[PDB]
Design a protein around this ligand. Structure first.
Ligand SMILES: Cc1ncc(COP(=O)(O)O)c(/C=N/[C@@H](C)C(=O)O)c1O
Ligand SMILES: Cc1ncc(COP(=O)(O)O)c(/C=N/[C@@H](C)C(=O)O)c1O
Ligand SMILES: Cc1ncc(COP(=O)(O)O)c(CN[C@@H](C)C(=O)O)c1O
Ligand SMILES: Cc1ncc(COP(=O)(O)O)c(CN[C@@H](C)C(=O)O)c1O
Ligand SMILES: [K+]
Ligand SMILES: [K+]
Ligand SMILES: [K+]
Ligand SMILES: [K+]
Lengths: 455, 455, 455, 455
């Protein structure tokens, strides 16, 4: 049912668990914000799957062969041809990570006053869109905002919402469609190939461009192979290649499905757009032949992207996350369903029924999880959404969750059992979790550096 | 009951993951001899725990700081102070691995005609003793020769057997006592501290030297902390240091409990013998400051020896092997008991009761294990026993076993489940396992290059 | 006169060593543009000293100990304490390289309509200043614009020019003073400590902030120790620490004097500005605890910054460049004087007097240098100057040069002889060097992808 | 005349020079024996070219891909096919270093009472020969024992001495001919292909086997390409392959011309001899599939052997040594001529004319070189030869030299200038070097651990 690791351990990293009394003082030192905890004080660090992956022996062999030249590096050509072969795009510009590519795309394809629509948003992607004068519109299906609803391909774009946007606003006022695979905020939920084919069908008829947020496209491809009829005989590589044939470009964070600790890139097919991207990348990232990355990192990212296409690797990656989610569900712990490809999301509304959203249950639950287990998790609720135009009123999203994000090839099933057993025991006395109050809030992006205090 | 890994994965090693029908063709190409399989064709390689360990990030950092000087390397001095601090011996000479140190010890401490006694033997250790003119005498307790007998500290030396040897032959005719921790041939069985203190008491009264075969002393130290009363408050380091306080020297294979892939050393307290050891090491290994080792390897062994002292590491190491043994026992699979610190031994005679020892049941069971799971194990029965060269007849041992030897920090519990589930599945249909016949047998060391075919 | 390397070679990098007739075919394939050569076809790559450095064994040991956590990495804290100890600034935000830090500084410290003044400019620094609405004013001393003038500390700011700006425009209309050490565009010319103290004296009296472009501050510190009276007893570290005591912050490119292949950071003393910097870094680079960098790269930069403080290292670095300049000057080759800390600039106008600037003598000389020696150099003349987009006419700079930029710890004196002997041999028959004509010119950034053919 | 390094520096190792007053105390602490100095106290360590080489980026990439399996490692198969391809031998057995292979060969091919003849000897090779009951006979040409005689191919075997040995002793009493390439004790002197062809011609006519000591065969191949008529058009690989076609086997120390820090192997063509070697290697070294080496070290040795065949690499290696020798000769310093492939030998008899061989001028000169320059060198004189059968009488060889041994790819020409300038200045007051007296002498192999005191 759950496969063993399709690899061996080459090298290990020592870990240690500090006692509860010290975890409590660390949590108070961090202002009850898991973002402010020190890495050395964490047993199992499930804060994010971004850049926290373990590399292979092949990737580390490439690390010893870094061609650090400013132009014409062999590492760049290797990364270039690999992406052209696997993704099928004509041009590629490397960037130091995903939000570097998003900065380039938002300045190239957005006119002040236009609309950008997509299946939910991400914080950095939406910021660069809004900074360049766009208004974001969520066109994901309504069921994606309901945590407990267990349906397949929750991340699909609602075609009726997309049709309604084109009719009310016009096609000329739409910059592009931003299709994310997978959808991070909905719980790592996949998008079906039929939805990608249908979106491409409707947008091309109105001359609207489609750009993918491809950070977790490999996990998305596995869900297509597993659950969409007609793709069970297709390889992961074939599905990934067909996915991108419905996009005019993409922004990629190699720190996710490329199995590296740093790196990203921007892809496109248009020649004029690629020429403008090279003029903008030298301002923010670097030369088009390295783009803010060391040669050895372009090499590791090229090798890692090819390793991710192995069916056994991605099957184990996804089913390890599913294993953690199944143990939590079997004990009655409320989670977002279905389990996504990279994380399990605890439903803090049901976990902390005795608390209101104004008491920040997700931020308080993440603090209690660390103090009780030594596991770091990320708040994904009201604090990440922010406040807008009303003086002091928070955004209220339906999803008030705590994210247990699994780095790739770093932890074992026994580590998943430690996480599950500690959360299940915490769920027994969930009424003890206390509310939080803002003692410091930045002007923007409060989730990263805000400090709180108990109620 | 079974702890999770007290570390996370830093880097992984790629494996093939070939299907069963291809593993069958690989096994036929190897003549149904697991010793002839190529490493690249193996999922889980349980052939040996020697030199197959995974190193830590700290060790690989030391690998980058290799002082490769021919004499006076900083890496040697680091290894020297580490062993002097942890083992308590005065002098140390590095060797490329354990049998290099045994070659030196046998030439230094044995006069032609003397006797060497010890708690059973190992192949290379007994050869160097006999090569230099010694006669080996087994003084282990009788209970060590009972495979199914589940008692603690099976590797203890029988004090009455040792007393009888001293009286009949004399103390001047005894070269030394060779005390192995643990006892590999008995199944990795530990020796009690009380037995070590008693041997030191008896030999010192007759002027007899005691040298340890300390290859797996860390695993032995854990058994003392776990099962011997009075040591439950002692750290692993304190137990190890007290163990060697009853010996005049030791031979160590770092490829086991020092958590490296190559290396060993020879320790002693006598100054004159250390002076002769330095003259002999330059003939066979190298300078006393590197002894057949690269500088970076002395550094990794010094770092690894200190990492082995962590209680959580060695507890998990031993309980990971115990997990495999308990799962096999709970399903009714016959194993050697009790489970040792480094391996589980399947009883192939009881596993393949429908086959005779002339049909090589252990060799045939090892072949089936690979084909069904991709797991390589080692035959330890009539094939590895060899032939008597005078009569031409096989040596026939009471132990017809298959050894599942677990490298340190390489595999997870999920890998142990792969091994267990496939063997349990084989045991349910064990009547289908067929005998083997020699199609090629070399003159000597037939275990390594013999080829077979089904009967 | 010229010291030997204060280090030995730990590991080497393979090179092709292709003959002259093949280098000619490579140059023709590259359209006679050294920017289009492949790295694998280059023996000595003097294109830039940015990110091309060789690291030490200590740095590579740190590469194995990367803490890749998203927040609170131990590598960040190590980098933080190192910069606070060596530079003396209160706060630090890491960036993926120098132009990432410049993007942050320009958005934080510039109000639309204000002025920025500095000792000449750099391309990326001036862009981010002008992008945020500033007007750049050159306040360097007039002597910096004389190529052949051999005087010390050519990069000093003219205090009278700075005083005139404050009086005519007002202090409230001045964003900050951008003091670069060293001054790249003037040829890597250093700034005196007395000039730094005087600028801090004048700006502090008017409430004006001073930010350093500290990319090559270590090379600058050596010039102070070597040529400025009163600092001959001071260590490199003491001089560096005193330099930054006259600044309110700095932007650093670790790819230069931090002896790494990627990395940078932003420093400042003000608490409120540091609070705003943490909100802005998560948009463009990443979390304030990694800032677009892998953990291992923050570790290598922390180790490399401390290695750069060794007097013997920086003395050899600078005198290796001086050796190349002295050998060219002793043979009569026209170079920019005095020789800077990181590169030698050939005067291509005097080298190719028989050619006009419309025939691209610097671009043609760089092509001949590669074909004759396998050395890549960078054109810094009319081609890299660009075209005015309104008129369509080339920008015509007084400096028509070829830059021989020396990476740190990569090449030896024998490699410098290869460069010198081939250029001296070319200078003896310089009348044979032919002009070039555009066969392909891109719309922008023509230096990188233009292709030429002989005239 | 002298080529630059045909590689770039990938990573560096920090070095440091301790003052003279500390170098003096270190030399006294070492008993005036450079073998007892600590590596950290040495600026330029010219003690040996064995295992002190710098590896390439390709080799370090292979280090990350160590297949550490006990049998069937991919690293072993790579090393096996590389040696079969480059050396042309049928079988190969890996060993941890050269003297491990010599131990195997001496036990396989020597009967007690037989003679072994060769072009001079080495300490470990002659010991294993004499330990197994052989009597060594030097059959090198007489001119090899004259330090100042500058003739080509000084290491050739005298065919008349070989013919005389066969006639006086008989062919059945000759175990084999041990042909070393190059000849270490004569100054690294090459053997001509014509001499190898002639030796093979004479021995095959009497049924006598020939085994090569191939540790520095690549350096030998370069001398053949440079100085022997008819081989100037042949590649290094072709010459190496033809060299071994005149041998029945070889012993190799990879620590020399394979550009690694540890490793060796034994080659042969006979099937019965290879079968016996596998039985003996498991006793002393390990399995025939790893032979006392980690997988990653077999990989580095396989990659390094192929890199050594590059003409530019070996040309620079040899001419860098020649550069040091030419500077010493141009200043009047007495050296062994011609300069060998791996070291310059100072003639201590002419250097210390005022001292007798009983005062150990070579051992005293090596001590003075370190104290005055921080350079470590090796004594190669009376102390290395030993005493035999007379009670207290030393062996007296014509060569009383001090060896300046150059590791491969570690030092630069500027480092050679530091060595030369310090020795030339020492030669000005050579009358100050004092004699030495034995204060401690081991029973055997006194050169490594003897301690001395001034006269
Ligand atoms: C869908 C998606 N797009 C873009 C980014 C930004 O990419 P980057 O610049 O970090 O490489 C992220 C980052 N998500 C991370 C940070 C997370 O989920 O924790 C993401 O999840
Ligand atoms: C010709 C020759 N053969 C064999 C050996 C022994 O090989 P090893 O066991 O050291 O790999 C050496 C070692 N010479 C070294 C030690 C030297 O000249 O310093 C040697 O020079
Ligand atoms: C108890 C014991 N002593 C000595 C040795 C020899 O040490 P080297 O292997 O380091 O020379 C071994 C190795 N046992 C290995 C070979 C096994 O169990 O497969 C051993 O188990
Ligand atoms: C003085 C100076 N400031 C800022 C920068 C930009 O820093 P990053 O390159 O780290 O973004 C550079 C780089 N100069 C390089 C590009 C050269 O001289 O080729 C520089 O020389
Ligand atoms: K770089
Ligand atoms: K070495
Ligand atoms: K990271
Ligand atoms: K190994």
């Amino acid at each position: 049912n759950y496969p063993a690791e399709p690899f061996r351990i080459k090298s290990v990293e020592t870990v240690s668990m500090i006692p509860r009394d010290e975890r409590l003082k660390k949590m108070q030192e961090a202002g009850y914000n898991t973002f402010l905890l020190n890495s050395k004080d964490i047993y199992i660090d499930l804060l994010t799957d971004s850049g926290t992956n373990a590399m292979s022996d092949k990737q580390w062999a490439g690390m010893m062969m870094g061609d650090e030249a400013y132009a014409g590096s062999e590492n760049f050509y290797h990364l270039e041809r690999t992406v052209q072969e696997l993704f099928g795009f004509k041009h590629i510009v490397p960037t130091h990570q995903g939000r570097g590519a998003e900065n380039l795309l938002s300045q190239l394809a957005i006119k002040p006053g236009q609309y950008v629509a997509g299946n939910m948003y991400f914080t950095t992607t939406r910021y660069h869109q809004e900074k360049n004068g766009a208004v974001f519109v969520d066109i994901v299906r309504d069921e994606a905002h309901d945590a407990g609803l267990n349906i397949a391909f929750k991340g699909d774009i609602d075609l009726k919402k997309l049709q309604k946007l084109i009719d009310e606003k016009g096609a000329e006022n739409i910059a592009y469609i931003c299709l994310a695979v997978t959808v991070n905020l909905a719980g790592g939920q996949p998008v079906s190939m039929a939805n990608m084919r249908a979106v491409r069908e409707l947008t091309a008829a109105h001359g609207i461009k489609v750009f993918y947020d491809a950070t977790r496209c490999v996990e998305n491809a596995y869900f297509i192979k597993e659950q969409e009829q007609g793709f069970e005989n297709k390889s992961i590589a074939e599905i990934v290649h067909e996915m991108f044939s419905y996009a005019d470009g993409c922004t990629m964070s190699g720190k996710k499905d490329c199995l590296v600790n740093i790196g990203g890139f921007l892809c496109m097919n248009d020649d004029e757009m690629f020429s403008s991207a090279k003029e903008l990348v030298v301002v923010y990232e670097g030369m088009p032949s390295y783009g803010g990355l060391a040669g050895r990192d372009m090499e590791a990212m090229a090798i890692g992207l090819r390793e991710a296409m192995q069916y056994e690797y991605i099957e184990h990656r996804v089913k390890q996350v599913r294993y953690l989610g199944d143990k939590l569900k079997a004990a009655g712990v409320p989670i977002v369903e279905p389990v996504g490809g990279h994380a399990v999301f605890l439903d803090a509304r049901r976990f902390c029924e005795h608390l209101t959203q104004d008491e920040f249950p997700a931020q308080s639950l993440a603090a209690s999880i660390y103090v009780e287990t030594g596991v770091r998790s990320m708040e994904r609720g009201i604090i990440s959404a922010g406040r807008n135009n009303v003086t002091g009123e928070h955004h209220r999203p339906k999803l008030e969750t705590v994210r247990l994000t699994i780095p790739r090839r770093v932890y074992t099933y026994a580590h998943m059992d430690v996480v599950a057993d500690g959360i299940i025991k915490l769920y027994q006395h969930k009424e003890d979790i206390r509310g939080l109050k803002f003692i410091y809030e930045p002007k923007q992006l409060r989730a990263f550096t805000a400090r709180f205090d108990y109620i």
